[PDB]
Design goal:
The structure is cut from a larger assembly and holds chains A (89 residues), B (64 residues) and C (457 residues).
Chain A lengths: L3 H10 L5 H19 L3 H11 L2 H18 L5 H12 L1
Helix pairs in contact in A: 1-2, 1-4, 2-3, 2-5, 3-5, 4-5
Chain B lengths: L3 H4 L10 H4 L12 H4 L3 H16 L8
Chain C lengths: L1 H12 L8 H7 L5 H16 L4 E2 L5 E2 L6 H8 L13 E2 L6 E4 L8 E7 L5 E8 L1 H4 L5 H9 L3 E2 L4 E2 L4 H7 L7 E11 L5 E12 L2 E4 H8 L4 H6 L4 H20 L9 E6 L5 E7 L3 H24 L5 E3 L5 H13 L13 H11 L5 H11 L4 E3 L23 H15 L5 H33 L1
Parallel strand pairs in C: 3-10, 4-11
Antiparallel strand pairs in C: 1-2, 5-6, 6-9, 7-8, 9-10, 12-13, 14-15
Helix pairs in contact in C: 1-3, 4-6, 10-11, 12-14, 13-14
Classes of the chains: A mainly alpha (89), B mainly alpha (64), C alpha+beta (457).
Chain C binds 3 RNA strands through α11, α12, α14 and α16.
Protein name (chain B): Small ribosomal subunit protein bS18
Subunit structure (chain B): Part of the 30S ribosomal subunit. Forms a tight heterodimer with protein bS6.
GO molecular function, one term (chain B): small ribosomal subunit rRNA binding
Chain lengths: 89, 64, 457
Amino acid sequence: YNSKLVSRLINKMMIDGKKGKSQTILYKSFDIIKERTGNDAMEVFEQALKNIRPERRTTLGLRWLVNYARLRGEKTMEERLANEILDAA
Amino acid sequence: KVCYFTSNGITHIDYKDVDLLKKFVSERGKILPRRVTGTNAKYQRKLTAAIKRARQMALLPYVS
Amino acid sequence: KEAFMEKLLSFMKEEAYKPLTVQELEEMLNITEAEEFKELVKALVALEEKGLIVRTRSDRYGIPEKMADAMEQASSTPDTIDEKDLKDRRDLRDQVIVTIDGADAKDLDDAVTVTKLDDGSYKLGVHIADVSHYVTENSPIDKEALERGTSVYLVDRVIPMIPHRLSNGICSLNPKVDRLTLSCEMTINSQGQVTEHEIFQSVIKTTERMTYSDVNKILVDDDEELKQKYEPLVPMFKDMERLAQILRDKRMDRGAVDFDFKEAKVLVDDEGAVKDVVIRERSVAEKLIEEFMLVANETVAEHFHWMNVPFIYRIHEEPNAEKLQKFLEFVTTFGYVVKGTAGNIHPRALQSILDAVRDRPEETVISTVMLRSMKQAKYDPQSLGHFGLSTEFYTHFTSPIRRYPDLIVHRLIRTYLINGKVDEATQEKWAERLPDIAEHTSSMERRAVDAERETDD
RNA sequence: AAAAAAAAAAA
RNA sequence: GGGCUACACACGUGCUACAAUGGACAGAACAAAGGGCAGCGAAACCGCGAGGUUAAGCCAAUCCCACAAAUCUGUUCUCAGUUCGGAUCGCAGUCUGCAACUCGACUGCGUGAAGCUGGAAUCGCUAGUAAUCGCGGAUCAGCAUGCCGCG
RNA sequence: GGCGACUCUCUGGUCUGUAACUGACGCUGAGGAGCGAAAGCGUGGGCACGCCGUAAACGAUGAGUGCUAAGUGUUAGGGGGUUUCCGCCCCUUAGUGCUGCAGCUAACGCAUUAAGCACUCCGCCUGGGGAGUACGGUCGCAAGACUGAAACUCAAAGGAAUUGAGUGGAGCAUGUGGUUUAAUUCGAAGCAACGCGAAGAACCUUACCAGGUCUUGACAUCCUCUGACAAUCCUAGAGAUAGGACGUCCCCUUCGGGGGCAGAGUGACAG
């Protein structure tokens, strides 16, 4: 998606330097978003962020997105994150 | 440590026996606590009365 | 008694003298009688009290040469200037000098005078409260003023940087009373260039305390009642307006970015109940004082830059090239095309956008996205320039009652210019401390702004 | 990047 | 012999949890640095396993240490004090020293605990900051939540 | 309610005994009686002595009895077996803590000293405010104490829990504690001491103690001296401590004698 926001979201999701896990979650989540909406995942994601200093705005946006996604009920993180983005949007 | 009186089998402490009592008073003449002399509770009490009787008859000092 | 004290002092002044105990002094003086020993002890105590000898931590006597508290300080500070403090200060008490502030302001930092010269240039005097005189380095109030870093202006109250007894009293440039100042006097030509300047210590006596409201009514509303009331000052106010316009035109021609955003002002009553929420307007009188404080600040910063001594600057770095690239793409959607590249934008190119969006529906948002693309200004020991003001040299000098950086600037002025102390050890001392002071005070400023906004919201 | 200030500054 | 390994009852400091970005449980790997002659020790090697075993090559780009792991992959478990992660306590073997008793390491093997994220504290911050994962060596009978240097 | 320097005089209660006797002779007790901080009051005193009787004197757990895991101190005795004993260690009562199961609790907790499971008896409560007030009191010397309203007013009031108003904590290490000990060696004792040592406490380390000990000693400087020094098996022991057997060659001699290892004694001293 050639997006620094995506890359930053991956870093917020990453635990114990396990960047691969977080990359996989995000790409799978973005697939779930495309399969439900039909819209481009990136477009939905940016809409989500809009609703959630400029650098600190993104920081807080991504931090909350991830923090609340983790608290959701759905079983996998890719679905939790997808649903939190879809809700945010 | 061990109780002097239970050890040596001394049932009766005597206020006249100054030399014995003097083992249980400090340099200043204060009655040494049970924890420091290893004395039995039973004999601490008998000992305390003996020392006080001794002090009264000027066998031991109140204050050195 | 005195002859004995002199003899003891003479003995201790000898080149071969080493710090001795009382017993070693007894032996060395051949004191054998108990009455002479008593005299020695009395002499040592009396000489130690007078500070002519010092007892060490090892009870040896030696020659010195050869070797709540903030509120107490505030309460001990005199409410009037001492005659001794007038020494080496320029007397300006007979000049027409005014303060121009908010009606509610009690902490008056700055006073101004403008004289038009025969050649058509202007002489601008900016006279700032000499807070550095009363708040000395490492004093209880100084340590607290560092910890606070700035005054905080909440909706209903002010948390002051220094105790109110000083801020509203002897430091405030109160009307028609003698006040100590650090002054910046500037000769300014018809193009707003400072041709000559002098930074010095002075004593002033303000002619009048004016308000921004009163000065606007005189200059803009053409109010005849207020002009008659302040008739002697009206000519000076008209010359101040003209000079401020010349300085503003120069600042805008240099390519400064005029960030004129509509801010809210919450209006409360004396009980702190909310009466109204209004737009904060910047009037002609505020903008006039702004230009005078700006040129004083630039002049002081430039002077110290060329002196090449450790100093504190108010810097605003170049915008982040990626954020600015996104902004340039954004304004292109509205049909605004900017001349330049994100890695080498001149401030003037951004100002040209603000001028083009003025009175347009898209103004507020282009303005807001432009701000978000800029960096925050901060304090720094390095003169890195001030992007938003389009200047190479900028510091804060003009508000030492409420900003600790200005108080430091005043101390550095006193150290380097007035006292002439430009030695290596003095420079090293300041070069070491200024980074920490700059970081801390920049942090305290952000903390204040975040709290002020939090009370507004 | 539509809702914004933070930072110009105001002072 | 004992104890410093108590442990009444503190702090500093260090590891293992508070799963799912993870537990099983298979399949595919990708590291550097450091060491070895009285040794380093392969195959095959006992072994449920832990240890023994005999012996090649190397005296070190030629042998051995030596298989980095984390990770990818499906199979579960499936939000459950659990397929959370591991305490503890039975009971089971293997080494070593003089002998594991106070007071070893390891595995066999039940039990599977706490814990489902700790106020004040007091830092900093993008590649392996970091954090995770390691890994080797020293030391050294035994054996590092220590430590050193290196991935 | 409360009692502490000591002695004597007079006199309560309790426990362990034990088993002789008595043979249910018991229990709770409204009333009543006495006792009852302090203070106040009263008189001679700066205390005695009377009223007055309340108080976190309820003390927020009435009294008695039976039944129902534990593990440990502390006070006073008794029983047993290493034990004269000393001294440990178990068994049992009485008092007094501590941590906990059953069960019980709204929760907090209680827990054989129950707030568990039971029986008997006595005191008490049935919203709050008004109100311990009113009023008759009754007791006093008096203050008060004592008994105890209602109209009216208000949907609440109240209890517990509550959660607020990087590292910590969860589980196991370590090091200096402290404490438990005969000894638990410390230096260091922020800095480097508090994973730190020493790069490895089972042992040695290890200091320090509890015991066995030896003594130019564990051993040197010595020396003069001479046997090499010993190895080794046996005896012991926890080994030291070694005692024996047996086994030893002085190093080197221009050969005067001086000299290994030191037997050997040596002698200030050993370290």
